[PDB]
Amino acid sequence: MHSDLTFCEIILMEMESHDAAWPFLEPVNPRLVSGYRRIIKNPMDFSTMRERLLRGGYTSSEEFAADALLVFDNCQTFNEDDSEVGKAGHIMRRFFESRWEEFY
Numbered sequence: 039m040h041s042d043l044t045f046c047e048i049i050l051m052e053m054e055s056h057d058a059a060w061p062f063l064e065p066v067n068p069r070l071v072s073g074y075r076r077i078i079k080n081p082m083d084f085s086t087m088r089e090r091l092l093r094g095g096y097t098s099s100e101e102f103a104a105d106a107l108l109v110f111d112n113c114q115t116f117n118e119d120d121s122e123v124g125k126a127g128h129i130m131r132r133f134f135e136s137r138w139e140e141f142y
């Protein structure tokens with residue numbers, strides 16, 4: 039639906055340009071971070087979400103919401119809350135939750 043998807047484009051653009059987005063703009067490189075592929079079974083990032091959105095592959099807003107929440111779930115799984123990626127992820131998670139709620 040047009041209303042459901044256009045809002046997703048707004049929120050995704052805002053998340054990409056957010057100051058705290060730096061840990062999530064491209065996929066994590068498992069060659070570079072010890073243990074990532076063992077622990078995070080479904081990686082996800084904003085650029086993957088952007089590819090899928092432009093491709094047309096999101097049917098409803100809820101699927102979009104699932105990939106978005108997946109970014110921050112994986113973040114909290116792998117990083118401690120006081121790590122730098124951790125802290126950034128909490129800012130990005132609170133931003134997403136609040137913004138999603140002032141649409142739906």
Ligand SMILES: CCc1c(-c2csc(CN3CCNCC3)n2)[nH]c(C)c1C(C)=O
Nearest residue numbers: 060061062066071074112113116117123
């Ligand atoms: C700690 C690694 C990590 C990043 C991370 C660290 S640094 C970075 C961007 N880099 C800086 C610019 N040059 C190139 C890449 N992403 N993100 C996530 C979601 C991570 C984990 C383990 O979950």
